[PDB]
Design a protein around this ligand. Sequence first.
Ligand SMILES: Nc1nc2c(ncn2[C@H]2C[C@H](O)[C@@H](COP(=O)(O)OP(=O)(O)OP(=O)(O)O)O2)c(=O)[nH]1
Ligand SMILES: [Mg+2]
Lengths: 553, 406
Amino acid sequence: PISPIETVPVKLKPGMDGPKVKQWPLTEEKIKALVEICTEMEKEGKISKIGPENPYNTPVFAIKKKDSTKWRKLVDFRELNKRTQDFWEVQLGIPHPAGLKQKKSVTVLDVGDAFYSVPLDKDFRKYTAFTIPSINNETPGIRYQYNVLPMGWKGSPAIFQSSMTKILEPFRKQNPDIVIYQYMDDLYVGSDLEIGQHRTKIEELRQHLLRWGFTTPDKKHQKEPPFLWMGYELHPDKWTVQPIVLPEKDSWTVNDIQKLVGKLNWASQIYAGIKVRQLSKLLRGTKALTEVVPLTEEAELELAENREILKEPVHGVYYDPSKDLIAEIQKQGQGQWTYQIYQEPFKNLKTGKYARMKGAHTNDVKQLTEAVQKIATESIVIWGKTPKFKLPIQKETWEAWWTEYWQATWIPEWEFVNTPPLVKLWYQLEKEPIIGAETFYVDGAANRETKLGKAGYVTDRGRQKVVPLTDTTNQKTELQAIHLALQDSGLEVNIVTDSQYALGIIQAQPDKSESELVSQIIEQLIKKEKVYLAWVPAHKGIGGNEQVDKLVS
Amino acid sequence: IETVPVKLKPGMDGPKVKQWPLTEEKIKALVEICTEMEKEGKISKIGPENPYNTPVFAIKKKDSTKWRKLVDFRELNKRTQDFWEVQLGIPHPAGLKQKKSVTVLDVGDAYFSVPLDKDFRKYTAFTIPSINNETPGIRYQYNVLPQGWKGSPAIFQSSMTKILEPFRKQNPDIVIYQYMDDLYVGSDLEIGQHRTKIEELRQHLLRWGGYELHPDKWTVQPIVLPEKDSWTVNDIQKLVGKLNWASQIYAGIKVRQLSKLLRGTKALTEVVPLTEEAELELAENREILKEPVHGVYYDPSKDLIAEIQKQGQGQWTYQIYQEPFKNLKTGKYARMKGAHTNDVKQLTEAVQKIATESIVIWGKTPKFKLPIQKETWEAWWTEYWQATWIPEWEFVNTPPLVKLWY
DNA sequence: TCGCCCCCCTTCGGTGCTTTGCACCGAAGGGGGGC
Ligand SMILES: Nc1nc2c(ncn2[C@H]2C[C@H](O)[C@@H](COP(=O)(O)OP(=O)(O)OP(=O)(O)O)O2)c(=O)[nH]1
Ligand SMILES: [Mg+2]
């Protein structure tokens, strides 16, 4: 059936015309699949024959469906899509089973031939011209245009989703206590009605859809748990992901490792503790998807750990609105974080991970804040509220961060949880100079065109140092100057630089960095006992700074 | 009534900004609000063939415990034609900042009585999200002058003038300034007598269709220098670097007779006595910083910029300027919510207060340089926003070399 | 030999700074998953 719903008017972009692209050759098994779909499609009014008056064409092909025996007709509308107007996509995200509530009665339905049940704007149909080849040599193919949404057109998903929403709107407003999760053409229908009354509403819903041209074949009508939905399995009390099969390989290509990492990210939504840092490192600096990449020892260990986790069966539970959401985060090392979201203990709604490296220089407290922000956003999306946090950072540590740090920062309601390793500041800078400690006037400079530079210091106790540097930058030399003072100084030291840059980095208390040189300084700062760091303007003859600026000349 | 033709600026297209996630209660409010607006014809449901979008969310003021829909048309406004080019926009009375009490009124609803150019409506599209993406987003566009669109006060200008003429004629010494959806209403009446005239104005409005500011007490905050009895080398290295920076703002500031004091590679905690020429140089620089800068004048044709530094203890300093180092106003915002403990809330409130001061003083909001990570700001700021307008902002990571404004 | 959506990890390139590299950030490459 073709929905009698109104067509959505659609345009080409201005000045643009339609596609004129030739059909490529196809197998005879695929030609026959298309002929049967097509001759049938013409009989249902899905397509119509066209003639030479229509100058456009676009290639067509066919893949198999997971309905193992059926075929999916696809058109390579890449060219038409470029010239088709932009759309505002109404699919804003993906529903998650952790956001579902426990329902007494559940049904999953899928609309048959969804796209082909929605008509296409009549003025636009001529641009969908295609041809079925039929073994190529003997005849010029038979030509058609679409009268309904094609699979492969940029606008078809949103127009279908919009049309489905309109069709469902009357039923939703008449049945506010029936949850309908509407994903493309797949309908999850939950209710707290008794099965008999529930199945009455289903029939009603299915009859309503049929009036609007949307069939609901029995083969796709799930009545009993476990329900297969969005790649999960819904039981009455719990849900699981459909099985995740990790690649097994003696020799790994770049593309294999990319596939493996993607699987593990997908698994991390319910399998706690997944890590992909070391496997993902292997993709750095590679140059082809087929380049063999040997697994490092750290990647093998990480893979082994992840396999042990994937071997243990897991399940998430459903959302209880009358209870608090609780998010708990653990630190895993090397900028990796994992979290669990629960309401009752040891009954996870879902898990996840945060491992992005934001910035060249950062610290654990910042990255914890980022994890918090990721979880908060995810929680708004799934449950419409943020959770209570349990974090492995002392209240004292946080208070020390957001008072000495110059940017506004914050975490919502959170509770300390002693789960080592704890998040902490790895050093602190004295806000007052330190009596008795040596004073270092540091400076470094490089010749902008030459690559050469000097780093050095002079000291109140009388010490003196210059270091030649090759292939550097202006900013590096300053960092080297700081590098030296920390290196040649006792556990207590006072330092004076004229690089707003270096002050900026170090004063942010980083504990990791993409720069090997900044990492060294971090190393040295952690070993120290007290450090006061101070700045002065360059080239204004200040005592100490001028002595060193001279010396580095 | 007949619509006013409206265009985007030449060579620009409409806004294409994604909807961000919303809490349950904000989605509920918006569904309720947009449903009612739909019935009343103020908005129409649209589909995805309209390629434009503008984020929508909802605020709720503590002293008005109902929700207020807020469409962030900042992008659409930047792309909308100017009505200064087309001679429809509003002027700023210089007397508003002279008043002892200024009350802010939300008159957004007056716009909903005027239809919008039907060729322009598509640019006003917005999308209500769905909890756990249960459904696709639901899209509307405006049929009437939208709240938050800069063309609304311009098109409704003549209407607003006629509504207010009797009140402004009956109260010559009250000053009313329209900024977007708001009326800024100032007088010199005793507080309780001010609030009664506000209630009167509210009544005159309802026969067609906040809390009190005090520009009296918006003191400027200067650059001060520490006073002590003993001075170390570090005290004077910090005094010199500070004054050197300040010599980009003020005129004839001198560092030569204080830097001399430091000559030599000296210990930071070494107590160095002031000379009499350093005391002269210091007390002199002190006074230049005391009374304000000669030669700084507002230019209405240029944008305002606001910088903010976190200073701790719930304190926040700020500068408003249009040209670097030519500050039109320096200040210090202090919170009192109660706990002491939410930086993002304090910064969000500091931003509304600073922007509120620019409207009262100059008639428009500044572009903010915010000392916060973009993602930290975006995780939380809507929870604390209470204004019907939103200022332009950008995000800056600025280590303090000097604690210049403290 | 297709489309649209969310996610993560890597890479690339435009922007603006009282710079001469550097940090930031959005976009696009790869991958996972959905229909
Ligand atoms: N362009 C494109 N669209 C797809 C693809 N898979 C699914 N869709 C779109 C088009 C489908 O009509 C719609 C529903 O997915 P289905 O798997 O249920 O296919 P359909 O309903 O058309 O046939 P069915 O009777 O359910 O087997 O989602 C794809 O691989 N490429
Ligand atoms: Mg289907």
